[PDB]
Amino acid sequence: KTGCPEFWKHPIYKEFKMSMPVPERRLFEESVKFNAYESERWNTNLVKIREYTKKDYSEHISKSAKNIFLASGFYKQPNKNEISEGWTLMVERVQDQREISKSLHDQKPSIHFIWGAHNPGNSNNATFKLILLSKSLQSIKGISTYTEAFKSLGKMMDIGDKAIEYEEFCMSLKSKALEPKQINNALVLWEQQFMINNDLIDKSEKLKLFKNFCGIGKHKQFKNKMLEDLEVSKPKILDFDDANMYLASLTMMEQSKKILSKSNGLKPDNFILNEFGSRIKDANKETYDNMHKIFETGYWQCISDFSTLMKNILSVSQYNRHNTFRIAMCANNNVFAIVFPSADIKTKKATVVYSIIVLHKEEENIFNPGCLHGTFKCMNGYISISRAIRLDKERCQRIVSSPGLFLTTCLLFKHDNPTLVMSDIMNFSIYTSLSITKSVLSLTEPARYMIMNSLAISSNVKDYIAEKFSPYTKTLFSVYMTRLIKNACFDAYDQRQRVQLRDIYLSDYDITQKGIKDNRELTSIWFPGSVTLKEYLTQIYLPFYFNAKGLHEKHHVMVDLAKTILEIECEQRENIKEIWSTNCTKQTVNLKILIHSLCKNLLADTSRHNHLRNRIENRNNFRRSITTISTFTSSKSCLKIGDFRKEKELRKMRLANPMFVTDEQVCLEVGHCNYEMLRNAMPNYTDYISTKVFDRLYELLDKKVLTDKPVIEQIMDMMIDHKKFYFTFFNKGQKTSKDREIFVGEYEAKMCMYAVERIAKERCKLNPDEMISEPGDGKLKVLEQKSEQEIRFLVETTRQKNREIDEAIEALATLGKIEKLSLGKAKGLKMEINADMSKWSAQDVFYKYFWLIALDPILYPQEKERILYFMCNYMDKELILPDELLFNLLDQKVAYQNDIIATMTNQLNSNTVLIKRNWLQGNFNYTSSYVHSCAMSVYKEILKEAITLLDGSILVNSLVHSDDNQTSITIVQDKMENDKIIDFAMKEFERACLTFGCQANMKKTYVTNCIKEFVSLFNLYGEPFSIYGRFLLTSVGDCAYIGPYEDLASRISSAQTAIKHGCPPSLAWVSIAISHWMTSLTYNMLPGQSNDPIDYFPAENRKDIPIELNGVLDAPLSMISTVGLESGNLYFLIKLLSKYTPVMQKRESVVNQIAEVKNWKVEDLTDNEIFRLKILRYLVLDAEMDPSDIMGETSDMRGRSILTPRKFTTAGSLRKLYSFSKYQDRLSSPGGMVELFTYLLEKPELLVTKGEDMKDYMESVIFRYNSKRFKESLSIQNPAQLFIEQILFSHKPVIDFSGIRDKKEPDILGKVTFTEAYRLLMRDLSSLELTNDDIQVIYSYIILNDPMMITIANTHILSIYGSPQRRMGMSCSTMPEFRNLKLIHHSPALVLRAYSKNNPDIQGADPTEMARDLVHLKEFVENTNLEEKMKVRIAMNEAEKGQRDIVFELKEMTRFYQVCYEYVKSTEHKIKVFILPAKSYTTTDFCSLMQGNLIKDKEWYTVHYLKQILSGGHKAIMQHNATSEQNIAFECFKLITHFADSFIDSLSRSAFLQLIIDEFSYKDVKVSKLYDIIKNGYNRTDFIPLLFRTGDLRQADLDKYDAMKSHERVTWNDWQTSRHLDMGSINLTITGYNRSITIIGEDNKLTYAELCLTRKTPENITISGRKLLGSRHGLKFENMSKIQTYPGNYYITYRKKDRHQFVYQIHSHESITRRNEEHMAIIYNEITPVCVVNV
Amino acid sequence: EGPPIKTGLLDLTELMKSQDLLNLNYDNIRNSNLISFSKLICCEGSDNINDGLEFLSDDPMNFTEGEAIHSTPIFNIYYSKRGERHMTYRNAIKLLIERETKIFEEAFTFSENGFISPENLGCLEAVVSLIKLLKTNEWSTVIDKCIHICLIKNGMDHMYHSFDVPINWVMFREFINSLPGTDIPPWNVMTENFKKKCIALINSK
RNA sequence: ACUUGGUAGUACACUACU
RNA sequence: ACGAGUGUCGUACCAAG
């Protein structure tokens, strides 16, 4: 109701106002106070301001366009000379910034492992291997630094002949589960754990081995370090450009390939083969051969041994005393590891210290990836020892999971490439998969951009190499990979010319064939061979996804990020003086151009919708309560500013920094800084804490800061109530070489930014259902569309401009004049600018957004004032330095030379830095995107003016994401050459970005001819392209370790996503096999392990167990891609249906087969089938057994899983929550929790919702605190800790399985183990009864209810494979008419809200479709007897106990709602864009293409169906009124008449049509019925030939047909072959009253025309010509050839009107000549004759 | 959807469901496979192939034509153009039959004499009887139809419905693995898929 | 510096865009 | 030694003799 008077006096506003010219200040102040609801017109302000700035905008556009004649054609080309100069500059810069070492022994281990082949002669017994190792260690011959220590270690592990005694002692120890037991010179503490015997080793040797060799205690503690002990030096790296270093790296690679390419002497037999070999071999035999060859090599054995040895090292790193050591072994009887004492591995930031030992018969037969310490002679061969290696949990996890990554990489790089050698690929892949250091990340991350920009037409790669590229080469493989990248960059440009376009087959409606030719001419990058363009791009983009996530150390990365932010802020403070400029100064904005462009764009956008404000309010719940918005009630983290001494405070110590030490604290000990010393040492320290969003909302509601008013009013009040904004930051932890800063703010800042972001979002052209962080694959289709359009523009235009030239040249082909003509024809040009902006959010001019708020016509003056006040306050925000960074900087003891952090914080007087111009990461995505689109509109205008200066044709398209930009330009001109145009276009693109305060990134921006690259998506000249491998590799490296089924489901979803992006079937099967194998490895479920379920369920093999019960996925690859994770149940049901259906109904639709289920008997069913059917009936369609305790759970907290392991419940995270204390207070009350349960029981809708007002929201939060899984979502689940959880504690009970409907402690503790869970599940399932009616319910509500499942089942049943075809025209396609396959229209949350509130019209749904959704849900509830069973159970329990149990009824209600939610969610199948070999026009076409594309890798087949797969049903027959059946009849007859005219002989067309009409049916409706509908309608004038041939035509039909002459009646007596390319006979007839014209011509020569009239006078001729040719006839008349004229004749002439609109008239010869000749005398619009007219 | 239309050995109703034969381009229909045409044959005792083709149209169709585009990334477009008087759907079907039947008969020679040779007849009997016992897999009906078509063209449609099944399942493996494979024909992949599937299924059985 | 004993569950970790 | 790094860190911690 009121605005903000404070905005006018704000310092930020005063600075913004005084920086503008006086008229601009007047315009801004008049625009803020403009009221579009009280002015004469809504656009009065925008039009006035647009007119005021029009002259400057026009001058800028014209001046930029006139630069096209000043271009020289010399753009930035990435040729070899420029790359060499950039590389030289890079080498100088890196030599300056790092310490370069040319010596070899400074190399770090490329792989932290050494390996040797196993000995077939020796035994694989642990004790025998231990004895052999002990004998080999003692018999070391020679003298070295640690030889005596190694021999002593061998001595103190000998057992002599007491192997039996050792085994019995170990068994006795392990049976009951310390005092070492003297066996023989060995102090054995456990199996393979020994105690350091002081009598067998010298003290000096022991100190040397444990301090110098292992680093155990060699250092001095932090409290004792002094000034002379701190290390100051630059990071030391190897000379990557040195010749000797490169030769050494090449020698290492050659030796690795020589040793690791041998054969294992075994037979490949593992889980992957035995489970998926049939499918892999069927999809592609070459993939099976490749993986079988991989399994036979030393690479596979080496990496598997390393993974197993790392697992065995981790499993014994828990209880290690300071004077002991351990021996770890693997399946290789020659490779051992010594594990040295360290901290407990499961503690905070703990490491593991190990040393690998290999016994090998011959020297030089050792795999040494730069890790060897020494090879010494011993009895019977040699013993190799590696250096001590210290690793942390993430690096150990990467090592353990490496084999899957190695297999995936090897199979991806070799797919369909006979020119590549498997050994080179395996060598590269083993070196890139076992790398756990930042050395190769620093190369993989920039290699993408470097090679892509070197391959480009034009790019700024030279300056990127010279200034930003910085290899970090600490290992020899880093040097090798640097050389590989250098060679690739050198060869990219001079092999660019080897890419060729495919022949384009276009048909006026679609492009059948397109893309890049697949010829193996390009040179392979990472290993010798030849690749195609697609394989080249895959090699460029694939290694970026090998990299490990989270290799950054907080200690250094926090300082790095703080330094980056503070450097940007200081540079802006001390060097950015002007806000507005006109010469494209960096970090400045052209004021008038910005204002004019914003006005023009706002006028265009707001004119398209008359209810934009209502769309903003309704789409974002502006008038609803704050508790109904998801982003305001989430479990995400927000910031709190206050006094948190008690919460954060968790003997005295003094700081290490001398600048913060009191004179009375010197006589103390130095210690690591914590909250207390930081608080004491900082005067102006502001206190803060991080809480959860929902908890912050609870606290704000409790303290009456937020009320029950609509959220928009609260936001508007908060915009003026909250004036000081505070932010903190943390490191994202991404796989790049440098981390990204992420900013966390307060709740009030969240509300204020939410309002502005939602206002700016509705104008953006982005999809509202997707996120900025996750761009949908729909863009993959959009790109294609654009390209197709542009291709058409390139084909029609050039041809149109070169028709005359081609005709003349051809007549002269059957010479100097020939080339003279050929150089005068218009040439075409294609350009693709793929750009990213540099520092999108950091180096941006925030002030421009001010105008975006002032010029908005959909806001009131008060709203504008409040929003602008919020923005002024936001420009005053303060970033809080994290306490950890302050700890880091307060224990240094040495002043940094040029400390930016100390300077910007006043020598650490405070912890806050003022950040003005940097709007933080992701806060203003939509506003910035809108301004970016305005900039692209300005650039497009400049290009259009420039091209029309050349009298050419142009088509500019621009896709704009947050900062990613893709601009495609198609140009057709005969004036200047193409390089000048390219140079001009790039210069103007850079200048257009600089005009709006943006800046093109020199690292990711490049220019191509035929390669579109939007966000991770490619368009290779009309053909969509995606690097599907990044979905496979990410499925291996990324794992949350939540549980077996959860990990398996996530990996299957990744495989499905890869399939949707064009993954060949064999590789998808390999990915699924690897996912299953890794999930079974992690949770000990392989055949013969602890948790193997095969012998606990009625299943012969793992194919017969549902994947929810740790089985494997048995489903065709067609079902997985289209449904996913519900394909197992569908395939099992289909197999049952085929098995038990009579042979007379075997080849019918799935519906007809299901109708025969009632004739089955339960007695003749296999026990496995009964088991799985019971699971489907009671665990999927019901909630008979709870995976965990459900009290406090909501309707959406029950997945598809059955056995869910428990996770961490961090008490430290929970106690920070304000609402958790309230919950604990209520729990410790006499009758509080029971009253809360009663309140929830009286209002059950709070189980689906979570409170739509203040009181219900608070009660629901307190109730949800009982969930025991909601508490696990608020806690910390470290993937490394959960990784070691499955290794250290494998037999611990973790599963909270609780039967059938209620029948010192570790942080993770369940009730039963996995095997006990299996046993209980079988005991409980057998107690249930399955009946034929139960099977009917299963089939009716898993298959029959969903049209999509019916379609999929029918495709599996009715498919008939056809002819093999070749992939040439891959295209993006969604499912056509998929809205007919949606059983339930709305989202499950909305449907459950409507069901609970019993209200079809809820605050977010359409009341019409929600009624049908509700009736579907009610039918499901009624037919499955869910509510009746719930009532019976409740009544039985109450009668048994005597009094009503609130807990039991609440649990039953929760189960009911969870079952309903799961059923509604199982209906929605998110079938997004698919990449298919051809174009899909129907649902049958889509299904057939998808099915035929997924059976072989080499070719795709044609699939037909015996019957209709999309049988009419409840969503297909229904939802179709009279007009729908009318359209069905129209389509049927339009199809049948032309089918008869095209494929049926002339003498048999009438009989064929009669048979079609009387006997067949179309879309389940009889053809006779359709013919009766069209005869009894008003549209029978559209089927005159049909009525005439049958005989149902009347004179009334003819009168109706010839009575429509009033609107000039246009008919085409014949169809043109191509109306866009102007091919085919033109036979057109236009008729009105007393006038008619008929035109005949072929291609572009109108042969003649006849004009029949009633008054032969020139006036009537001209008026009739204007009235006829001005109709909607579709003939162009300007693409026709110009003809000569003769006196006395009349001609159809065309003339230009709107530079794209034309006028067609009929003129006389003298008229044309006179007007043209007087028009020459003074652009140049002359009357052009086309055709002759006979009057 | 409706009952089949029997005009000679052709089935016009099943022509309606053959989407790859509904091209209006003479070159596309002429250069198809026998697999695309096999779906149209339901002779049921026909000794000739040129009777039902009289029910196909005789109007001129389109044919492809190519043309270079004057652009920096050079490429050639191929479009449709109104064909001559002899480019008819019936003529394209006739040419398809003439080429593809010969190609298939060369691919299933199995003899030093020819396709009709009695040893080849016994081999084809064994091939058809394999699918008579083993449940029809996805890559069998296509071959059955092509064999039937080529027997009709070779004048022994009689010796296709007279096929008598001769079972020891181990014998099949040998007889099949020793069966040679084609290289040039579209059956360079089809017949090998058939052999692989049949041997795998008999191993499972 | 050395010997013995005792203690230790996670990076207490995490944003915007649905 | 190993991890990190042109930011001083990790390289277990505590008590006793």
Ligand SMILES: Nc1ncnc2c1ncn2[C@@H]1O[C@H](COP(=O)(O)OP(=O)(O)OP(=O)(O)O)[C@@H](O)[C@H]1O
């Ligand atoms: N993980 C993220 N969290 C939050 N916002 C993000 C995230 N990633 C991207 N954004 C948003 O998208 C914008 C684009 O970021 P992008 O990754 O393209 O780099 P940039 O910050 O523009 O810098 P540069 O290209 O110079 O590395 C960011 O400025 C930010 O607003």
Ligand SMILES: [Mg+2]
């Ligand atoms: Mg960017």
Ligand SMILES: [Mg+2]
């Ligand atoms: Mg970007």
Ligand SMILES: [Zn+2]
């Ligand atoms: Zn026959």
